[PDB]
Amino acid sequence: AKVHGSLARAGKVKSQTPKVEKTEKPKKPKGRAYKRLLYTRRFVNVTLVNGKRRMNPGPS
Amino acid sequence: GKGKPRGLNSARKLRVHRRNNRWAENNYKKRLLGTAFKSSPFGGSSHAKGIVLEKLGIESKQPNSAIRKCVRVQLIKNGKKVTAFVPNDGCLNFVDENDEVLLAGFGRKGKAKGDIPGVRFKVVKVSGVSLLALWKEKKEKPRS
Amino acid sequence: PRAPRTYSKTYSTPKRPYESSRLDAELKLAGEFGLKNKKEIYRISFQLSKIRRAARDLLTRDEKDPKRLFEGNALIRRLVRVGVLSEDKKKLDYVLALKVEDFLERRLQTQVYKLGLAKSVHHARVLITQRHIAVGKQIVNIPSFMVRLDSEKHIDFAPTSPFGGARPGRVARRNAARKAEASGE
Amino acid sequence: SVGFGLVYNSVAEAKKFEPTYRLVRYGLAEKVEKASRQQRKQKKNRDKKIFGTGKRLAKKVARRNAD
RNA sequence: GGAUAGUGGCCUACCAUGGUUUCAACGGGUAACGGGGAAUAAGGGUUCGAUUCCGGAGAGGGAGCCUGAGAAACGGCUACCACAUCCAAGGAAGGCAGCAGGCGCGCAAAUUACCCAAUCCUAAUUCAGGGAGGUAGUGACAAUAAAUAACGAUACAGGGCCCAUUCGGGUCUUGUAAUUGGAAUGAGUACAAUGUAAAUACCUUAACGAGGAACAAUUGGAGGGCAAGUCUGGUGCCAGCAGCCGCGGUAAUUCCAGCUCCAAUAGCGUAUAUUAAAGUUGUUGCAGUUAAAAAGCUCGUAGUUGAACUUUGGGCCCGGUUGGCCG
RNA sequence: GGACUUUUACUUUGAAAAAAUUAGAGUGUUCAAAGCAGGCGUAUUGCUCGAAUAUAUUAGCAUGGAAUAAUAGAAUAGGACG
């Protein structure tokens, strides 16, 4: 099938997507400490039980 | 006992037969005939470099409807020609013709990947630098 | 032209990649014992898995087979010396039992806590790795050291460092420097 | 700190039975340093190209300073 | 008989017609040096070994040979073929598949450094010599251990929990905190001594070295298989994704991004191959009515296979090895 | 020492058997991959444990077995022992 299409538009969407810079945020602990934070998150303090559980909910 | 000779001295016939029917195993055949070397744009190697002839815009198969940016490439080691897709958004912006690129397989043993017909390869590096670092911003395409 | 300096690896790695349950349990072990890698668990579960293998192979042997006797009993005495195998259950059917937790709980990491000195497995870590505590006068800074049962009586502090005398340390003395240079002369 | 120690039954026996580098470490032996290893080798390989004492060749190449 | 150090069609002379083969000769292929081995873990297997030890072969290709106990030697010679260096044009020289280092090739691989101090070898020999061998450099090949933080106070919130007629906060801590608090340590820097032939690191250790501008973790993923959003913004069958099923044509749970989250973690992605999964090569252990596959039919040689029956039955001794009830 | 013996396959035990590698015992390289060390006193004139075991099949040797499965024999007796 056709081989010589149009290359005029390559890189279109990325180049026309509004640049939002990264947001400067709290330092996240590198190492055993991240696993610590993870444990106390998942299996110590418990956020919710909306039916079951949600590891990453938004608005609800 | 269905065909196969069960006797105590019929080793010969059994392994012979085993060879015979080994030949119906596609990758046994191909590994034994030498196809990896004989055919195949790469020489059986994992990767191959080569120069860029022209820039192609390959309309994808059905039921998809787009244009897949590629290049025609002549492999240095063995002069064979082959067309390679240029991954990610843009990146056909990174090449230019007569450029010296680095091709790898598409992870299907031959077999074109998605909706891209007859493209069994891809671009990994150009001009000495990695296409990825270019697409991000880590690095910049060398002189010429 | 020289001899091969031999080596081997100490960890295996789960067949299934994302089995949510095993991830749960693994995590629990990590946070409970203060481990930084799932590797630190994998490692153990590999070591153990070799033991068990050696165990199964012996169990198939005839009772009072020379190899079963010598090597089986050798393995048994070995698993006793550390503190994983109980003196009660001591005839290689429990070594076919066993579990990772029994291994985990025997680390210097775990012992330098379970009887004081830490108040948290993490403070255990940070202490050990910072040239504090010793067995003999021999300082050890490896979280996974495994306390060898009869050394349990010697997990004190180091002849150096604070908490066991010899010197306060550069920070304390920097503060002493600030007091002595400000509040005095 | 753990290591090893010798103690000889003389000072002549020590100066004769010891590695020379040790004597250098202590205070009993100069370090008669010499031309580099490849310097030495190269000097030998120069030396190989000559048969005899050499003086006859030097004067015969002094005969060259005319013709 | 000759020739060899010697056996032999090894060669010559005479003489005969023999030698191998479907139990596959002979020929071809090999991106084929052989072995110890290696990768893959139910077993049986499959795959691989140029490469630290052993054996063989070669020194650009071939032949020929001197010396010698030993070479058909190449860091020996001779000739030819290819290559190629210097010149005063008459000539003369070279052989890195030793150590480096260079060109070429490519997807693919480090220093033109130091030493004989160890390990050992050779010589007329304790000394001399050894790019054998050791030393460091370059080195995310593969392998091991495993820093990136630990602990109080306090601001409201809690779940605990006795009391509840009802303010509540009260001291057992769950910890989310946009003010805090003093503790701790090596990464690095650096006396010293140690290390070393001399050095360099390491193990030691004076003076130094942590508060977020830090000494600041990364690589992928968040529709399914597959752990983790139905968040905001962008694009609008375009650009892009997507191993595979599929997403995108104006509310995109797959694209470009921010946020949040997951997974593995000083490492993670990818491409090629291979092994397991694969009872999809099936001896263990496959399948052949209709899904892939019984030859139109019978003979039949090589091959595989092949009914039953020939000292069975009784008696006595000898001395072992566990184990039981006692010790 | 003299005189003769039908041939096998199977199985057992054994010898002959390099190391490294693997399986594996011992020893706290501070742990660990490793290494084959080391451990003890009179630490001013020594004392001493080691440096294992296993596999190493096919073929050849050696030894025990006598089921299974082949092979040979006395019919034109040209037989057996004396």
Curated annotation (Swiss-Prot), chain A:
<comment type="subunit">
    <text>Component of the small ribosomal subunit (SSU). Mature yeast ribosomes consist of a small (40S) and a large (60S) subunit. The 40S small subunit contains 1 molecule of ribosomal RNA (18S rRNA) and 33 different proteins (encoded by 57 genes). The large 60S subunit contains 3 rRNA molecules (25S, 5.8S and 5S rRNA) and 46 different proteins (encoded by 81 genes).</text>
</comment>
<dbReference type="GO" id="GO:0003735">
    <property type="term" value="F:structural constituent of ribosome"/>
</dbReference>
<dbReference type="GO" id="GO:0010494">
    <property type="term" value="C:cytoplasmic stress granule"/>
</dbReference>
<dbReference type="Pfam" id="PF04758">
    <property type="entry name" value="Ribosomal_S30"/>
</dbReference>
<keyword id="KW-0689">Ribosomal protein</keyword>
<dbReference type="GO" id="GO:0022627">
    <property type="term" value="C:cytosolic small ribosomal subunit"/>
</dbReference>
<keyword id="KW-0963">Cytoplasm</keyword>
<dbReference type="InterPro" id="IPR006846">
    <property type="entry name" value="Ribosomal_eS30"/>
</dbReference>
<feature type="modified residue" description="Phosphothreonine">
    <location>
        <position position="47"/>
    </location>
</feature>
<keyword id="KW-0687">Ribonucleoprotein</keyword>
<feature type="region of interest" description="Disordered">
    <location>
        <begin position="1"/>
        <end position="34"/>
    </location>
</feature>
<comment type="similarity">
    <text>Belongs to the eukaryotic ribosomal protein eS30 family.</text>
</comment>
From Swiss-Prot, chain B:
<dbReference type="InterPro" id="IPR005680">
    <property type="entry name" value="Ribosomal_uS12_euk/arc"/>
</dbReference>
<feature type="cross-link" description="Glycyl lysine isopeptide (Lys-Gly) (interchain with G-Cter in ubiquitin)">
    <location>
        <position position="55"/>
    </location>
</feature>
<dbReference type="GO" id="GO:0022627">
    <property type="term" value="C:cytosolic small ribosomal subunit"/>
</dbReference>
<dbReference type="InterPro" id="IPR012340">
    <property type="entry name" value="NA-bd_OB-fold"/>
</dbReference>
<keyword id="KW-0687">Ribonucleoprotein</keyword>
<dbReference type="GO" id="GO:1990145">
    <property type="term" value="P:maintenance of translational fidelity"/>
</dbReference>
<dbReference type="InterPro" id="IPR006032">
    <property type="entry name" value="Ribosomal_uS12"/>
</dbReference>
<keyword id="KW-0832">Ubl conjugation</keyword>
<dbReference type="GO" id="GO:0005840">
    <property type="term" value="C:ribosome"/>
</dbReference>
<dbReference type="GO" id="GO:0006412">
    <property type="term" value="P:translation"/>
</dbReference>
<comment type="subunit">
    <text>Component of the small ribosomal subunit (SSU). Mature yeast ribosomes consist of a small (40S) and a large (60S) subunit. The 40S small subunit contains 1 molecule of ribosomal RNA (18S rRNA) and 33 different proteins (encoded by 57 genes). The large 60S subunit contains 3 rRNA molecules (25S, 5.8S and 5S rRNA) and 46 different proteins (encoded by 81 genes).</text>
</comment>
<dbReference type="GO" id="GO:0003735">
    <property type="term" value="F:structural constituent of ribosome"/>
</dbReference>
UniProtKB/Swiss-Prot annotation, chain C:
<keyword id="KW-0694">RNA-binding</keyword>
<feature type="region of interest" description="Disordered">
    <location>
        <begin position="159"/>
        <end position="185"/>
    </location>
</feature>
<dbReference type="GO" id="GO:0032040">
    <property type="term" value="C:small-subunit processome"/>
</dbReference>
<dbReference type="InterPro" id="IPR001912">
    <property type="entry name" value="Ribosomal_uS4_N"/>
</dbReference>
<protein>
    <recommendedName>
        <fullName>Small ribosomal subunit protein uS4A</fullName>
    </recommendedName>
</protein>
<dbReference type="GO" id="GO:0000462">
    <property type="term" value="P:maturation of SSU-rRNA from tricistronic rRNA transcript (SSU-rRNA, 5.8S rRNA, LSU-rRNA)"/>
</dbReference>
<feature type="modified residue" description="Phosphoserine">
    <location>
        <position position="183"/>
    </location>
</feature>
<dbReference type="GO" id="GO:0019843">
    <property type="term" value="F:rRNA binding"/>
</dbReference>
<dbReference type="InterPro" id="IPR005710">
    <property type="entry name" value="Ribosomal_uS4_euk/arc"/>
</dbReference>
<dbReference type="GO" id="GO:0022627">
    <property type="term" value="C:cytosolic small ribosomal subunit"/>
</dbReference>
<feature type="domain" description="S4 RNA-binding">
    <location>
        <begin position="106"/>
        <end position="180"/>
    </location>
</feature>
<keyword id="KW-1017">Isopeptide bond</keyword>
Swiss-Prot record, chain D:
<comment type="similarity">
    <text>Belongs to the eukaryotic ribosomal protein eS24 family.</text>
</comment>
<feature type="compositionally biased region" description="Basic residues">
    <location>
        <begin position="37"/>
        <end position="47"/>
    </location>
</feature>
<comment type="subunit">
    <text>Component of the small ribosomal subunit (SSU). Mature yeast ribosomes consist of a small (40S) and a large (60S) subunit. The 40S small subunit contains 1 molecule of ribosomal RNA (18S rRNA) and 33 different proteins (encoded by 57 genes). The large 60S subunit contains 3 rRNA molecules (25S, 5.8S and 5S rRNA) and 46 different proteins (encoded by 81 genes).</text>
</comment>
<feature type="compositionally biased region" description="Basic residues">
    <location>
        <begin position="56"/>
        <end position="67"/>
    </location>
</feature>
<protein>
    <recommendedName>
        <fullName>Small ribosomal subunit protein eS24A</fullName>
    </recommendedName>
</protein>
<feature type="region of interest" description="Disordered">
    <location>
        <begin position="34"/>
        <end position="67"/>
    </location>
</feature>
<comment type="function">
    <text>Component of the ribosome, a large ribonucleoprotein complex responsible for the synthesis of proteins in the cell. The small ribosomal subunit (SSU) binds messenger RNAs (mRNAs) and translates the encoded message by selecting cognate aminoacyl-transfer RNA (tRNA) molecules. The large subunit (LSU) contains the ribosomal catalytic site termed the peptidyl transferase center (PTC), which catalyzes the formation of peptide bonds, thereby polymerizing the amino acids delivered by tRNAs into a polypeptide chain.</text>
</comment>
